[PDB]
Every structure is written in C-alpha cells, then in structure tokens.
C-alpha cells in the first residue's frame, strides 16, 4: 500500500476571458513534474521523471495533455454559458488524478474534481458522477459530459492502464531517491506561556526524511503526555520539519529531554537534555533582541 501518485490540476477562471491552468505531479511526497500555464511542455523536476517510458511514448502523452488543457479551458467556459444564472465567475477548479500502488501488481485508480474548494465530481468506472453533498444543478453538466464517449474512453485508458504502468516505471527508476534516508537535526528553545510563571519548551526537529518520525519530551523513561506535536512542515530541499512543545512551570526544565526516533538514525535515538553542555552553547549563538 506503499505509494500514491497524484496529478494535480489547478484551474482559475476570473471572467469570460481570463483563465489559467497550472499542474504539479507528486509521487508520495516527492515532486516529479510541473506544468505552468505559459509553458507549452511538461517539465521534469527529477532526472527519473520520464519513468521507463520511451521518448515516443512520452511525446504521445504530452501531446494528448496539450490538446486536453486547451480543450478543458473552453469546455468550462461553455458550461458557464450553459449554466448561466446557476453558476458564474469567478470559478476555481481543482483536479486530482492518479493511482495508489500496492505490492503484488495491485492498483487502485482515482480521478477527483473539486469545484470552489469542495469535492463534487468523480470519474467512476465508465462515467462521471456526482458525490454526496454535490449541488443538484451538476446533474445536467454531468449528463452533457457523459455523452462524450471519446473523452470517457481516454480517461478509462489513462486510469485503468496508463497510471499503473507508468507509476511502476517511476518506482523502479526513482528507487534511490524514494528510499533516501536523511538524518534529523534537533535543537531546543523556550518562550513564556500565557500563564504567569509558566514556560513553553520547544524541541525543533529539521531535515529528516522520510516523514515518519517520533518526538517526545521526556523525564527519564517517563513520556510527558503534555507534549504537543505540531504539523509537518516542508523544507526546500525535500526534507521535513517538526516541533514538539511542552508547557512547564519555571524550574521544571531541569531533568527534561527531547527524544527523537527516526529510521535514518538506526536504533540510535537523538536525546537532547534541557540543561546540556550543547544547549547552553547553542543558546548563546541564538541570542537576539526580540
């Protein structure tokens, strides 16, 4: 159940004339392609982005996408003309297409459409259909779009056959990048809490890859259950950043440590004690005026 391949399309329609479509492609949490509106061709963001496909096979798909992008734009504009009072610019459409890969040549495909930020339409089997909660007026556009047997046939091709095949090539060719292990670097800080005489201890953890990580404030072998893990934040070099906070009363700091478990570390956890020789020296280099 290892990997999700995602083609993400972002289409903005301001008015009857102005429009742009930009796309990005992801395998897991690594970016493989980008497609700007002003770019005629799909760009590779990795050396292995073409997968196992030949130059002829790639050019064939690229040509198909070029026709589609232009065709999508006008089709939406026509639907607005058709839908009239119901809908009207500005229009924001997000499209998420791809497949989830599994061990043993097993695959599931998907094509999801969001309208004005809300998930409204999916391609299922042989045709478009509304999802629960979708506005009732979508019934007509879906009927109209489902009358296009040609578009449907190519969608089915890309979903049933082209995704699973292409992704498998991507998984093989990008093996070294997908299986990379980058070591986390941890450092400590603190700020005053809203409560008087209380402090919030912050354990910063940066530069780790892959994403799964374990961070807890500790007093000896005792996990501090007041530890609040933050959100995973991306770094520019395709690594992750995370911080865990803990609320203590002034004086409680001594004896506490931030512990970090990560696959790149082996079995050798990073243990960072609050009062440490290194923390003291690193804090000296961190001083500022606020």
């Amino acid at each position: 159940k290892n990997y999700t391949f995602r083609c993400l399309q972002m289409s903005s329609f301001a008015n009857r004339s102005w429009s742009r479509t930009d796309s990005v492609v992801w395998l897991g949490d690594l970016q493989t392609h980008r497609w700007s509106n002003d770019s005629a061709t799909i760009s590779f963001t990795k050396p292995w982005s073409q997968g196992k496909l030949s130059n002829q096979q790639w050019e064939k798909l690229q040509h198909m996408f070029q026709v589609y992008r232009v065709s999508f734009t006008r089709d939406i504009q026509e639907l607005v003309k058709m839908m009239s009072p119901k809908e009207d610019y500005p229009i924001e459409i997000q499209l998420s297409a791809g497949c989830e890969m599994y061990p043993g040549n097993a695959s599931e495909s998907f094509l999801h459409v969001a309208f004005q930020g809300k998930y409204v339409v999916r391609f299922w089997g042989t045709s478009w259909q509304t999802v629960p909660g979708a506005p009732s007026w979508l019934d007509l556009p879906i009927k109209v779009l489902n009358a296009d047997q040609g578009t449907s046939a190519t969608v089915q091709m890309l979903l049933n056959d082209t995704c699973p095949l292409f992704v498998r090539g991507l998984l093989e060719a990008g093996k070294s990048d997908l299986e990379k292990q980058e070591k986390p670097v941890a450092w400590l800080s603190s700020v005053p809490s809203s409560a008087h005489g209380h402090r919030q201890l912050v354990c910063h953890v940066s530069g780790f890859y892959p994403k799964p990580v374990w961070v807890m404030w500790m007093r000896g072998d005792q996990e501090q259950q007041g530890t609040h893990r933050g959100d995973f934040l991306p770094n520019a070099d395709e690594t992750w950043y995370l911080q865990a906070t803990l609320d203590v009363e002034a004086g409680e700091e001594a004896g506490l440590a931030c512990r970090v478990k990560h696959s790149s570390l082996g079995g050798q956890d990073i243990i960072l004690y609050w009062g440490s020789l290194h923390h003291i020296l690193d804090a000296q280099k961190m001083v500022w005026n606020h």
Epitope: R74, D75, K143, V144, A147, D148, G150
Partner: T-cell receptor, first 114, second 113 residues
Framework: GGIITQTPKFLIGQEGQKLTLKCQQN?????MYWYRQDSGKGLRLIYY???????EKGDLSEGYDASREKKSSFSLTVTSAQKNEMAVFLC????????????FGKGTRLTVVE | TQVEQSPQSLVVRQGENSVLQCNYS??????LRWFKQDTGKGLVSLTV?????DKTSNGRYSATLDKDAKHSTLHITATLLDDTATYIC?????????????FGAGTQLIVIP
Amino acid sequence: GGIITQTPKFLIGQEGQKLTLKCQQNFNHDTMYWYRQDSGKGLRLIYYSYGAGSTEKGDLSEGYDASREKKSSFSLTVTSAQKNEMAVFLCASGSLLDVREVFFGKGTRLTVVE
Amino acid sequence: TQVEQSPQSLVVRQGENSVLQCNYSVTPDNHLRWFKQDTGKGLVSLTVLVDQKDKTSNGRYSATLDKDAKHSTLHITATLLDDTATYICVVGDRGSALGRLHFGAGTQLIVIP
C-alpha cells in the same frame, strides 16, 4: 420527427434598415444556431443559444443581435443592413445530449436594394 | 480555413462514380460528417464518421475517415442528375454539445447527362 423552419424564405432589405429572421423548431432541442453562408467561404457561426434567454456570440456576431424567447424559437436581427449586401442565413438546432444530432433550416436569402 | 475540400468543382459523367476529398487540421477531431446542399436550400445529412479508421454508407453515398492522415473521402456510386449540388465536409471538435462545428467551403458537383 419534426421540422426546423426559417421565416422568411426571401427578404428584401434596405440600406441601414433593421431586419429580423425567425427560426422555429419542434425537435425539443435546447441548442440553436445562426450561421451565415458566404460564397466560397463555408458556414460561419453568428450566434447560438442554450435556451431562453441565452444568447452567445459566435465568430461573426458583430453587426447582429439575437434573442431566444422560448425553447422552440430563436430570432436573429440584422442591426444595420449593408449597401450592396446579398446574404444567405442558415438556422440549425441540436440535441444537448447528442452532438451528432443537428438539423438545418432551408435558409433565408437576403437582397438589399438601393 | 481549418477544413479544406478538393476539388472546388467536380464534373462527372452520369452513371460514373464521384470522389470528393476533405482535409482538416482541427483538434480534437472527434467526428467528421458530410452534408448535401441543393441550390437555394439547406444542409441535408449524408453520413457521420466517428472512429480512427471509419467507413460508413447511406444509399448511394459512402465515406471513409482516416484520422491519422486527417483525411476523408466521400464516394457517390452511380451518379444521377439529382446529385448536382454542393457537398460540405464538417468536423466537430467535441463528443459533447459543448463543441463547435468547423465547416468546409464545399465542392460543387456537376453531373452531365
């Protein structure tokens, strides 16, 4: 199982006069079209409609206006008839759920007199 | 402009076979169809072609479509005097009613007895 009829079949125009062409259809078609046929060129879309009162500009909308009063009826107006203008106008209707189903009217021949 | 028909004018002896050509560059090319227009009249549907390599027939009319070559030929078998008309090739750019039709200038067929 029906007809699409344009009226009038022939139209006498005068320089600067406003002209009105009517097209009626009982195919139960939501989409209706107004084309212009010039010699040696090929049909060119003036206006089209998804229903009343949808009026959408085609590539040759300038100098014309259109109105869809109801589903069966789609009118085209010539805003200002040109001096020596001889023209042929063709109405068509199509099914919204079948792009291959399109029927055309018999045409309207316009001659603008001095 | 995007739909080109040749020849401009075809003269065929009665009883003989006529061949009419259409070349296009419209994309996508979902379907191509042929229309007959009598003088002082409208367009009458002859045949609709849909597949990558397609053959259709309708009475004495038959047509072929090659999408890779972007080329279509209309055939008229055993030409009668009533075949005298303009023949128009038309390409539709979508498989849905959101599409537009692209009209050829037409081929005048003249059938001499």
